[PDB]
């Protein structure tokens, strides 16, 4: 494509969503993009089409605009079973193929949101006996199921050695998910500290841990 | 309505090939494309679109290299045949129409449901399973935030409980990740009263049942 | 290879059931007649406004084309 | 043989310089345009209404031609 | 306006060839029909009408036989090519515009002047000249109706004249008229006073000036 | 063609002459109709066309119609200078050639008409004696120039042997032409009597001799 979507957009239950889409004079909007939804253990599904039109059984609570020189979906009367990665299309005849902005992930709130609970659990004795170490971030107790999250190394960010999971469905109805560091017993042992950073919609949560210290 | 309906498994070793149909409800060929797509878990959708009779002179440049996404049709309806195999090759792959010309149109009319194509020759791995304890009362909030780290496993689903199943009732899990290396990632939290810290040491029980790997760590404040 | 007086000018390949519009350019029905609908009602090549009153069967092509589905190796 | 795609329907014999109807059939121009006001505004085959504002060039047959014109000994 | 211009003479000996143009004026061939057509002496107009390319594939079965009729065209512009040519090939050969299509619309657009086209190997022939007298005064009308009846002769020019020239104001000339033989024939009448029938007899002088044959005969009533 | 066209029509110095023309249903009327003017000594040309369409330099004073089931041609404020052959054109798809009526030749009348006077010649002493006779019918001062000559002997009309002239123009302004027909000695001898019968507008002028007779 030409230029990419906005990863997410999040709005409450009963209220209408507005995802947008961009791109360049011959695609997108001059000639119209289509609008899908996919969510995981779903099949994906075409909602809208040339200018506004929508396929048999699509409700008319979705909308769409070609206003000025973007598109546009509007999703009205919100639900939680709207929740999807929404995708915006083009075709250009400079890029001759079925060619797609990014995807803009639909978030429904139907509780209220908060920031996370996170503990952060240094590299324990087992895994120093076996010549290892992992720094593991465990994030609970969160609403909406997005965060981002960053390492640190006494005060540099951390960008290597770096993986994460997906969130879980808690029995009290709040998210939890996961982000681990990868070290050696020398990089674990060398430093004074590290530390886990959970941003979630305006405040970010970090948790500590010092490499030299004992309880 | 239009409807396609897709065929599930996909699991292969390295080098065979994989042969399937996606059904066609409601018309046929002739007048649009018709084209797959497919999706890697936790990434986006990658190209196998744009039909030209058979097969396609309008692809994604980076994609047909490899065993050519070789998914393309017979006597143009919905098939895939794709040959000499490899774990790289993983996706979730997808049937549907849309427009034509040397053009999507703009859009993709009818899905199907998405068949899981696996390809593996190793045998079921079990995890590396280190405990997790907190550093103090304060910082774990009050109560004892009490885990374990299970890593380096195949295929994802594993089992973690405490105490030999006599502590469940607060015990959460946590999601699997799968990353680069073709293994998981998983771990699990459980909340305990406080004044157990200094009395009763916890033990997580990981049970990897694809493989038959047990096994138990120990988890008090150090 | 097969000729350019066989070929269309949207996905510039062979044509088998041609029709042709008010500017005397020739396309395939079946992707042309849904392309003035799913792109627009305008002529690919000069780009004037052209919908699906206006484009019309082209039957001297159609029997050109015969000539060479009936016989050769390009089928 | 001259071809029967090659030819009109109203000298019936091979065109140089052809336009197609509405109905998708196609004349040589400078006999069928001067018959349209020389016998009338009709269709040579089905007969209905046609006149020169109708009657448009036919590019992919101005093509064929071309293709034997510039190589067979039709001339 | 447009024009055109014929050539003239046109006479030929038998087995001979007739090779000459017609000029096009404000037009050429291209999106007209161009043909000619023909009007023997005394007859109506016959076919050369609508042409194909150079030629014609719609002509009169019953005219294109003998040397084909071969005017058709040069180039497709205006000519005539008749060869090996006879006597009942003679007629007015005539260069138009028209229609087109296997049609020659229903207009002739332009015309030409006609090509007098003529054939004969024979000598100039003089008449058998024959005097012609009234049988009474009642049924001449009460004047002298006096006569001569000057037969096969060609070419079609002769004098009649009366009395050695002295009797002229008096004296009228019949057209001639040609026959299927190839040769003509003509008559004159003279009124005089019907007192000179009983006292002078008329001559009346005959010279086909063409052959200088001079025959002169008396006329009287018997 | 299909049908023919009426020999002539006669009409007076400043009147309208009328000229009909007839065919089937694909030709000279739903297929129009061209007219044409052609007169000994001078060139051939179109008159009206396409309904009443005319070439340049072809006046007001002709006009035309395709009335009904016919073609027609009108010409109004009559001249010597219109007198000519008129023909009427066809093409029908069934007969596919640049055919035509017959042609209607115009009479214009400048002066008062009447019919000829007529004096019949018997074969002469001269022509005997060659083993030949000729029995000659001389017509003169007749308007307008055109008469229709029938033959007869002893009461049965003759149709071999004859032959006629066109009429030539007399120093007074009227008409004369001459008939024909060829006799053998024998033939002219053994009847009793010979006449020629020249029609002319509603009268017929006859003159006889006799074989048997003399002077």
Known sequence: PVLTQPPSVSKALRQTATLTCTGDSNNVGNRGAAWFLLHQGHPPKLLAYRNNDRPSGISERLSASRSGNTASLTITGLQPEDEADYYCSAWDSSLRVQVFGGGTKLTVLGQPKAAPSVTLFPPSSEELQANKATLVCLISDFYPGAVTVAWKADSSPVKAGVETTTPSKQSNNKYAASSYLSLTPEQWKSHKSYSCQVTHEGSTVEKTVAPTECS | ?222 | DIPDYLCGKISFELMREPCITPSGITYDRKDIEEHLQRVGHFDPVTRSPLTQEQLIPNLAMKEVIDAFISENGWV
Chains 1, 6 share one sequence.
């Open chain 2, 1 to 222: 309505q239009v409807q396609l309906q897709q065929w599930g498994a996909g699991l292969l070793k390295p080098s065979e090939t994989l042969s399937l149909t996606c059904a066609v409800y409601g018309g046929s060929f002739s007048g649009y494309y018709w084209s797959w797509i497919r999706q890697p878990p936790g990434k986006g959708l990658e190209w196998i679109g744009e039909i030209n009779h058979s097969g396609s002179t309008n692809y994604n440049p980076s994609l047909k290299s490899r065993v050519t996404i070789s998914v393309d049709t017979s006597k143009n309806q919905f098939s895939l045949k794709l040959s000499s195999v490899t774990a790289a090759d993983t996706a979730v792959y997808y049937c549907a129409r849309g427009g034509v010309g040397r053009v999507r149109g703009d859009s993709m009319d009818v899905w199907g449901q998405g068949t899981t194509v696996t390809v593996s020759s190793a045998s079921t791995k079990g995890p590396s399973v280190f405990p997790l304890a907190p550093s103090s009362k304060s910082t774990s909030g009050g109560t004892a935030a009490l885990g374990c780290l299970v890593k380096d496993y195949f295929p994802e689903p594993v089992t973690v409980s405490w105490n030999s199943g006599a502590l469940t009732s607060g015990v959460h899990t946590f999601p699997a990740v799968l990353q680069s290396s073709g293994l998981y990632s998983l771990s699990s939290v459980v909340t305990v009263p406080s004044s157990s810290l200094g009395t009763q040491t916890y033990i997580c029980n990981v049970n990897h049942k694809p493989s038959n790997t047990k096994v138990d760590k120990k988890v008090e404040p150090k």
